[PDB]
Ligand binder design. Structure first.
Ligand SMILES: [Cl-]
Ligand SMILES: [Cl-]
Length: 162
């Protein structure tokens, strides 16, 4: 298991524009296109991203290319974030993967405001952080996924994903 497989499980794969859990236009493996209500807008954003006239449908290969770029960007966002980087650097590999999953889902910004959880994580106070992370809108909206990520962070193993 690794970040890629892990996220491909949490996000799924869809080759036609779809609405995500928040009602936003998405495609591929969790690639958010736009927070706007317009599909035309979404379609425009897709075509710019892919570099062709897609008409709202992409191939598997294209989905994977967006996904790779998105994972890469999530990492780099963490490393560039003054609140997040030291937390991340302090952790082992499995737990770093849990953190990338979160930033992938919620944006660097969204994750950088879990101040309290970040501190506990950095202190290696796992059960506590786990409890704190569940006290969030994130957990109340997408509970099944949040638990998976939260157990991974908690245990530092991939059991939630087997
Ligand atoms: Cl893009
Ligand atoms: Cl979920």
């Amino acid at each position: 298991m690794n970040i890629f497989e892990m996220l491909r499980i949490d996000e799924g794969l869809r080759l036609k524009i779809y609405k995500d859990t928040e009602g936003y236009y998405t495609i591929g493996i969790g690639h958010l296109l736009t927070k706007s209500p317009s599909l035309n807008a979404a379609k425009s954003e897709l075509d710019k991203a892919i570099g062709r006239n897609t008409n709202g449908v992409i191939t598997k290969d294209e989905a994977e290319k967006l996904f790779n770029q998105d994972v890469d960007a999530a990492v780099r966002g963490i490393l560039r974030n003054a609140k997040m980087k030291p937390v991340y650097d302090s952790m082992d590999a499995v737990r770093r993967a849990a953190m990338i999953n979160m930033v992938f889902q919620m944006g660097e910004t969204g994750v950088a405001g879990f101040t309290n959880s970040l501190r506990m994580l950095q202190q290696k106070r796992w059960d506590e952080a786990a409890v704190n992370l569940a006290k969030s809108r994130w957990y109340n909206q997408t509970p099944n996924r949040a638990k998976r990520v939260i157990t991974t962070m908690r245990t530092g193993t991939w059991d939630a994903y087997k």
